[PDB]
Amino acid sequence: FVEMVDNLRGKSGQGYYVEMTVGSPPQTLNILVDTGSSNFAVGAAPHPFLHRYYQRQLSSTYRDLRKGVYVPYTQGKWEGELGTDLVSIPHGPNVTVRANIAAITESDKFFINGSNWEGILGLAYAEIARPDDSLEPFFDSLVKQTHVPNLFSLQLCGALASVGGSMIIGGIDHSLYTGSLWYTPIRREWYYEVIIVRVEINGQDLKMDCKEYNYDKSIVDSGTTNLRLPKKVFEAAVKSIKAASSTEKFPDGFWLGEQLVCWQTPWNIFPVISLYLMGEVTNQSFRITILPQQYLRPVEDVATSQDDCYKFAISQSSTGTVMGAVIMEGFYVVFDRARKRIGFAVSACHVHDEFRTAAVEGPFVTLDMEDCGYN
Numbered sequence: 001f002v003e004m005v006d007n008l009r010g011k012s013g014q015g016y017y018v019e020m021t022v023g024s025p026p027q028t029l030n031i032l033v034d035t036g037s038s039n040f041a042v043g044a045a046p047h048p049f050l051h052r053y054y055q056r057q058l059s060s061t062y063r064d065l066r067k068g069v070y071v072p073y074t075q076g077k078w079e080g081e082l083g084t085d086l087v088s089i090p091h092g093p094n095v096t097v098r099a100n101i102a103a104i105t106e107s108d109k110f111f112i113n114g115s116n117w118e119g120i121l122g123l124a125y126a127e128i129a130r131p132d133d134s135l136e137p138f139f140d141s142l143v144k145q146t147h148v149p150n151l152f153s154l155q156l157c158g159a160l161a162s163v164g165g166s167m168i169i170g171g172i173d174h175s176l177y178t179g180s181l182w183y184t185p186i187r188r189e190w191y192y193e194v195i196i197v198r199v200e201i202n203g204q205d206l207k208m209d210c211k212e213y214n215y216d217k218s219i220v221d222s223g224t225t226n227l228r229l230p231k232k233v234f235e236a237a238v239k240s241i242k243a244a245s246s247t248e249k250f251p252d253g254f255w256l257g258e259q260l261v262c263w264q265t266p267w268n269i270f271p272v273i274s275l276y277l278m279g280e281v282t283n284q285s286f287r288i289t290i291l292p293q294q295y296l297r298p299v300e301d302v303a304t305s306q307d308d309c310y311k312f313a314i315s316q317s318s319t320g321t322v323m324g325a326v327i328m329e330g331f332y333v334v335f336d337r338a339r340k341r342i343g344f345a346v347s348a349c350h351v352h353d354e355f356r357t358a359a360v361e362g363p364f365v366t367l368d369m370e371d372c373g374y375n
């Protein structure tokens with residue numbers, strides 16, 4: 001897996017991408033790695049923000065599926081033409097597979113003006129593929145057509161500053177993490193859904209009905225930046241973070257992500273956040289702990305300010321909990337599809353000081369963990 005280490009690149013706030021090839025001869029494309037969706041979809045027309053795009057006319061192995069796909073999101077959309085072709089990952093396993101590909105022919109607020117990627121690799125399950133679950137996602141195709149084991153893992157390292165990481169396809173690289181992996185079950189194979197059973201700020205329990213933590217979902221998502229929390233949970237978490245960091249006060253807007261706060265930096269004033277996840281065994285949980293250096297993100301994009309402005313990277317949501325980069329950059333994350341589970345271990349590349357560290361600890365006893373799932 002040494003050939004796969006450090007195969008992820010990107011710019012701060014613009015996602016992680018991996019080099020891929022599509023068609024014959026191979027066409028090189030940078031593709032966003034997204035555990036939050038299930039479509040392999042690439043730009044196929046000269047959108048002026050794109051460095052490169054899939055040219056179907058140049059591929060001898062392209063096959064038309066004679067079907068369109070329309071994908072709206074909250075903000076905008078993407079739209080495309082479904083087909084198949086041969087796909088490779090130059091810094092992945094030495095294999096070539098026939099995969100479904102959405103050729104994107106129209107988009108709005110999908111591509112990022114200024115980024116170095118031209119497509120998306122949805123790593124989640126068939127159930128949330130567009131237009132329906134008959135469209136087999138890339139990873140399913142990879143496992144069916146080769147001996148590549150049914151798992152992948154992600155080390156997202158963070159630092160517009162350049163970001164880096166590793167996607168290890170088909171296994172686990174033990175030098176990307178310290179301590180032991182701890183596994184939480186995949187509750188259902190659609191998103192990577194898991195169950196949060198307890199939340200603490202600075203070891204202080206939030207004491208909420210644990211069903212609020214997973215209302216209506218909790219998911220692991222490499223395609224989101226923030227730790228997103230349901231509004232009711234976010235409201236309590238914010239109140240508790242504010243009380244923990246009394247030493248200095250901040251306007252309501254900052255906590256709401258409506259404005260930035262700037263220095264010329266004190267980490268100790270801010271609390272650690274702990275999430276307890278359902279463990280592998282009846283009545284057993286474990287906890288993941290992140291620092292302010294994960295949830296307080298630098299903004300370098302500030303043109304009207306030559307100070308160190310930060311964004312509060314926890315926000316409200318109506319789609320459930322989203323464990324985004326705020327969480328994932330603390331940990332080596334194993335997506336163990338073979339055994340319907342997700343593993344977490346302290347990341348060897350995570351940003352920390354000399355007083356506190358990201359942590360993965362257990363076992364703990366936690367009763368009635370079933371009840372924390374929304375139905």
Ligand SMILES: Nc1ccc2cc(-c3ccsc3)ccc2n1
Pocket residue numbers: 034035036037071072073075076077078108109110120221222223224
């Ligand atoms: N993990 C995520 C989060 C947000 C996403 C939004 C889009 C999209 C589609 C049409 S416009 C924007 C696609 C994939 C996404 N994956």
